Design a protein around this nucleic acid. Sequence first.
RNA 1: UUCAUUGGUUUUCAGAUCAAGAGGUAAUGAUUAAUAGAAGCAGUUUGGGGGCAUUAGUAUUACGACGCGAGAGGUGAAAUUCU
Length: 127
Amino acid sequence: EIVFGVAHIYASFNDTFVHVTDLSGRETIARVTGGMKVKADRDEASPYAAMLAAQDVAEKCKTLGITALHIKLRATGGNKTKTPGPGAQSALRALARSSMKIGRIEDVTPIPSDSTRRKGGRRGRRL
RNA sequence: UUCAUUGGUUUUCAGAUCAAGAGGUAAUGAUUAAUAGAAGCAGUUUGGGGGCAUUAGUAUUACGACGCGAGAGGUGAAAUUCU
């Protein structure tokens, strides 16, 4: 009846991913992103494109019979940003308002115990 | 010094100094413990203090495999760069 894949929405600066896959994570369903939806090479990050990604996946997993999903945000925080970018809320609105009745809203962004030396160098990114 | 003068014999004197008594009545003799300091201590401890051993944590790169698709990275915008 109900069936549960996951979503793995990876919403950063400059890009957004919607990567629906198995309960394991391996066998993917509708890998597509928002960066393959707007033809400008700067427009990849827009909330239009995160919908325009999620306007495609949320039907395609229905063509694979997926009724329900879990959500896993990502930021892209390594040493880096550690907050989801502009099109994170643009996907979950686009995904949930396409008849995918979901509950689990988690955030697997990485969070290290003071790891190595992000770039820029001690004064960096002077603007 | 007196033995007129002068010494062998030795005492007073012992000008003396050094032993010397148990002639040792002796208040017999050692200041306080700095809100100085060092030191000690069932002490009770406390601290990312120091050294060496022991290990842990996610993350990062890399590499493997499995799946999925072609775009991914980056910028104010690109491109070099990866596929």
